[PDB]
Amino acid sequence: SEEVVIAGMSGKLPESENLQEFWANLIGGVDMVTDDDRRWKAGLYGLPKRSGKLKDLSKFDASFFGVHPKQAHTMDPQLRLLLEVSYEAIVDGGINPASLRGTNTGVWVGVSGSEASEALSRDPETLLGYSMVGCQRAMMANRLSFFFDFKGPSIALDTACSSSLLALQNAYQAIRSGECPAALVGGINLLLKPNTSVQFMKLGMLSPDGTCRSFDDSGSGYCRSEAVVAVLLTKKSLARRVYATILNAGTNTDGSKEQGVTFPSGEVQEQLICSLYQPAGLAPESLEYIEAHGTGTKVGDPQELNGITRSLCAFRQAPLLIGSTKSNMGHPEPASGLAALTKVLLSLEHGVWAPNLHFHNPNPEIPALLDGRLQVVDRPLPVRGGNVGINSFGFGGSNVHVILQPNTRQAPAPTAHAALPHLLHASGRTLEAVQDLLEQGRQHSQDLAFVSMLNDIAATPTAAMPFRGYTVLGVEGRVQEVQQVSTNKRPLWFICSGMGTQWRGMGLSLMRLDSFRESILRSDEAVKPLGVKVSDLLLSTDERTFDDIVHAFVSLTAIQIALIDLLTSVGLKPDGIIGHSLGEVACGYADGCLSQREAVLAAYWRGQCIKDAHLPPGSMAAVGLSWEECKQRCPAGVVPACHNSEDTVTISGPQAAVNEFVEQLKQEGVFAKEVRTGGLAFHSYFMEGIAPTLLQALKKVIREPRPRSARWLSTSIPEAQWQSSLARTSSAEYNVNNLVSPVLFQEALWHIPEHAVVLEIAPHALLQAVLKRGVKSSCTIIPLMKRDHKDNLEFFLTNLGKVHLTGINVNPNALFPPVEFPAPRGTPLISPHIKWDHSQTWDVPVAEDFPN
Template structure:
């Protein structure tokens, strides 16, 4: 059976316009949770003053995505973001989105609500109808399938905080069972008005300081956050690049609990995780790192980590490494699973585990933190290459776990030097974008795989990418040119001549 791999990824995270910025913030220990009035006045209604916010949600290239301005103005910013990062994740995989048109590609999006939809439909006399197609949760998947012309399953999934990792689990099994050949998987969450935060605060779930102190003794709730992440999942035989292999994925639900519907069940989490590793024939000792749900709540952290310990730590010679990206950026709820995946993928690419923040003293209700069976990654730690697990749990009891195997590093350390210059092509919406791509190619002139990926995605139609450019890699002279192409295809001219003067043509 062909392996299923993570072949492309893109995202917007708090204080991070792209995954490069996200990694710099992670590895440098930047707290991406901030106090400012980008969404509402800090402290409004007694809310925590800090939360995680995207830098910019106001811009959208409607023409590129075939959206009429009237529709764009009443389209949920969550959908606008998903269109952008979905496109980017395909290109990141070295694939031209146009080449996938008509393919049996699935779309699975984790999303829990549309605060924009509620705002747009407040006054019935001002309704235009466009907010229905722009804000319905189904459209976060269906609009992507429509734009890319995908014919596979198209599903929006809501299990609260586990939504996006459940979307990945659904996509994994969809490919494995033949429902689709590849899949776009996404998760998105925006905090556009304070009402939802007020409700979580009334339920006692939020940290008064606005900090996820994962696994720490002072953990007293979680901090809400925004995120949008998209992942391209394909069979290995189709992939142009491989970030990691998905070995197994599954989900279950807590069922009835005397303590109430939002009380986590460590027993059911443990049962899920154990069954997945047994099915994949992976021993606990092979697992190097678990990216935990780790919200920093009094009840949730002990239930989760004590369950992890029961599965993985009976006969280990070295401590199991754990972490939670929520300590760095807050909890983006339905997008949290893919945000955690993004951190894991970036760490695997760089060969070092990004550190947790706000971990100072071990939670006394998690004995394994004190006796050394489990170690919180609170500083950059080199990766050994073992198996990785990712947890994601919904507050209604929906549990998801995914198992990843790191991509094998290429052994071709020294490719034979090129004797001839290589043409590098690029296309973009603007002249500046094309120049930036060509410059990036020059910076990575020795990376043949990267140059091949850039050339592969340079054939987008001029109607969507009107600027074209090229440069010569490995040339003594700085040969480079960028021009704006014709939006419509050039007409084909035929010249026919018969007679004694045809040699002049």
């Protein structure tokens, strides 16, 4: 008792480079069996000219999989292709492979041949030991387990034609029982060695026409085909996409039979099917369609379909639809079951059954074809609803049957939170890969499940996926950016900005996000008793509301908090924090020293204690000279107040010297403008008359001071006394000290390391210009809001995408209400849009590499 779902799929089939191409051929009625000379001179040794073949075996993004070129040239192309296809299958489910690393996830691979092994070991003189590691059959599973870090069972298995569906069944049992949370299941077959086809020809199993005429009177054997298919199974609770739910599955074996080991026993096949329906409480009446093995042999077709008649049709009012993918693409031997499973799920996802080919006259030995109890799908029929069965029977008697319940979940009805703009990330091996995924997102921008899944798979280690991109969906522009990434560790720095960042109706754009709004309404609970509401202050576009120092300090800090809350919701944890002036309050919230209440109220009283105080009329001007040069050329009573950069220093004093010894600068052509402080001289001795009343209110607010982490660098206290006990905590004392001490900003920026990402946390990104000058060129400086930007939600999103571009992972899904998985039916496939770096070309065995 644990629910098992088919979550993701991918594959390569005859004439079909991915499952989109496979579908196109299926529903299009294209015969994928061909007669060219791809593997060997068609007709050689009197073999059928027709076989189902893959378009290509020579491509493999070796460096992504950690495989050096010498090892790649000696890998079974089965395995090279299965690595890609496996990755494609996992992400198709909307699951980041990283989230399964180290889990007890299993791998089962159905595989019957190792022809590359034979070829690559033919010459003792020149063969490589690596050939074993890349060709021994166990490695078809073990190398997958090695790459993905799956620590559950890792098993290669052969039951001939039933191998891959057996593999599925084994995986299903492992998940059901609780052994495994998930399973990668594979099926592979290649036609490299002609001698192999000769063996089957001499047994009389191959049709001369190279065609599986499933169910037709003129069936005379099967068509050999290739396939590489992979499917991700998970338990229901882990799944995002859900193609179908596995209701039951089992295997039996024909046993002893008078007629020989390769004569299939319809009677035992019947026993298997019977044992999985009524005994498990599942009615044959619930089936809509059964995918038969259907190899088109004189003997097997009647054994199978008659067994189906006795086990299923006999317990039914309605005709049972029946098909076989082998009619479309031939028989890929152990991969038959997964190949067929692919057709079934593709059919279900598009709402229409892909038809059989080659069905002209029913086999007269099969009563149910003649009386309509079985109805062959020879035209595209719509999917009316119901369960689906699948048979795979190996030529040594090993039988498998699985029962699927299709996922029929419909999409939600759209709501107001769906209409907001959304952010979409991608990563990739090539810029094409990223563009292709972003394009696919633009096109299905309203499918919210699809966008969630694509964001989840975008958070990938940067050495693996060196191109990244983002797009903002649901906005007038075409907002998109894509670039190559530095393999560097990129550390994350929060910068909380000070005064001068206020504006009319700031953050009203971001109240559409629930996490932002809830942070503002929580900031309201702190300052309601004191007669003010931050939401009312934001809403008010009375244009002088933020001239009041209390209105500004409280609103800036409450927003800085809401942004921090967003950044956190999205998974951004800072490596360093730095505050400028009033920013040191928000910094405390970011660091874990201050609760939201403590920070908002520290902002209130910091402003209210200035409002109530008689300080002498003072003013500040930024001036164009160094910190050191400001010591000398200042008069008395004017002091260096903010060390912004080595060019820009704010000074503070009374007008009694500030205006007149600003002109002794600006007559010598030096930069210098007054700043709108609301009439005060901050970060100077002049504020020291606030200390007693502020220190009292803040001791009633910051109950028990908590330590400041190493991550938080003070700008109030110079580096030499970071060890001091004033510095140790964010106390009432630290805060008061900030307000009277200078702002030692460039001093903290000297400590930001190479290749860092720096986020300016503030309702307008005032300090961008300073940060660029003040921190290393190798760093990337990112704003988060602009003043009077038409849409700040868009601006925030675009910049949050810019963080994804650096290499740092970001989950924008958390900004919006959670999507209810399982995803609805018909959510677009992801596997076909996964693009690899296929610039290299690897060796492939040829017919001449085998004996003759």
